[PDB]
Amino acid sequence: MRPALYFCGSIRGGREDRTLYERIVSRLRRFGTVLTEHVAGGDRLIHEQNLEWLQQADVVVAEVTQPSLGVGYELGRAVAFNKRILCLFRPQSGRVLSAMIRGAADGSRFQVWDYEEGEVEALLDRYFE
Amino acid sequence: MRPALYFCGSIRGGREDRTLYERIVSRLRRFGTVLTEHVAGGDRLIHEQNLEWLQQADVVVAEVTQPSLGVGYELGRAVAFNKRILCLFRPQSGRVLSAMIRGAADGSRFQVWDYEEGEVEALLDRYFE
Ligand SMILES: O=c1[nH]c(=O)n([C@H]2C[C@H](O)[C@@H](COP(=O)(O)O)O2)cc1CO
Ligand SMILES: O=c1[nH]c(=O)n([C@H]2C[C@H](O)[C@@H](COP(=O)(O)O)O2)cc1CO
């Protein structure tokens, strides 16, 4: 019925980019249904729901600037499902993207884009149009 | 020829637990060959080598206290390979383990152990003997 875009960003890793994430999610809605956590014993259900969303998504979009086990885990499951993946990283003095994420990239099905906050809407438009 | 144990810990996520990791690795050597990064354009090879180590390991051991994309990614690939997994977490004021890692646990093939530094050698002995 509609293209599904899975979005993932850090939560327990840190909520420093929480405002940037809502900007990304709101842009993504222009291109399809966005499947993403709504962030304010429960962990198993959280794992289940994100795994199902990732599996049925047509594109996986990850903001990978803040280090996060959960985001890395979701990317690992996404790769093993051979998902189309877009990773968004903001270079910063003292912050280097994991070699496991940068090294997973191939420039087509798994893309890593270095960007800064001001251009994120333009980047998303360019990737999705 | 020998049982292989894959060990993963944060690097670009942060090297705060680097001394704890060497203690874990040195204990793991008692139980088999330890496949792990030796930490002091290169990312693709790093990704390749860890992915091959994880795939041929008989147990995957991850220290998941420090949030890390790479460790999460390795756990995601390990789960999709249906690896036997042992995750080690140290609870701390203000630090909560990712729901994606805690929620992935099943108490048998994927185990999450909460522990503190003083007992890590005893824990490893108990899991591996
Ligand atoms: O409460 C939550 N709800 C949720 O959906 N997640 C999923 C989605 C996030 O993209 C990702 C964040 O992982 P982490 O919490 O380790 O930073 O894991 C993670 C948490 C907290 O771990
Ligand atoms: O230089 C490296 N060598 C290496 O083997 N890795 C692998 C193994 C680590 O267990 C894991 C750490 O990931 P991260 O760097 O995102 O914290 O990724 C990661 C890096 C740096 O990303």
Ligand 1 pocket check for A72: Cβ under 6 Å: no
Give the distance from residue B79's alpha carbon to the nearest chain A alpha carbon, in angstroms.
8
Query: Is the Cβ pair B11, A99 closer than 8 Å?
Result: yes
Interface of A with B in 68-97 (CB under 8 A): 68-81, 96-97
Domain B4-128 of CATH type 2.60.40.10: no
Question: How far is B101 from A112, CA to CA, in rounded Å?
Answer: 24
Q: Please state, as a whole number, how many other Cβ atoms lie within 10 Å of the Cβ of residue B10.
A: 26
Q: What's the reported resolution, in angstroms, to a tenth?
A: 1.8
The torsion defined by the Cα of A10, A74, B6 and B25, in degrees rounded to 10, comes to 10
One-letter amino acid of B65: T
Interhelix angle B69-80/B43-56, nearest 10 degrees? 40
Q: Could you give the count of Cα atoms lying within 13 Å of A96 in the half-sphere of its Cβ?
A: 11
Indicate the SS3 state at residue A91: coil
- What burial letters (b/e) apply to B22-40, b meaning 16+ CB within 10 Å? eebbebbeebeebbbbeee
Question: How far is B113 from B117, CA to CA, in rounded Å?
Answer: 12
Q: Contact A108/A85 with Cβ under 8 angstroms?
A: no
A55: its two tokens: 């599996």
> If you measure from the C-alpha of residue A23 to the centroid of ligand 1, how many angstroms do you get, rounded to a whole number?
18
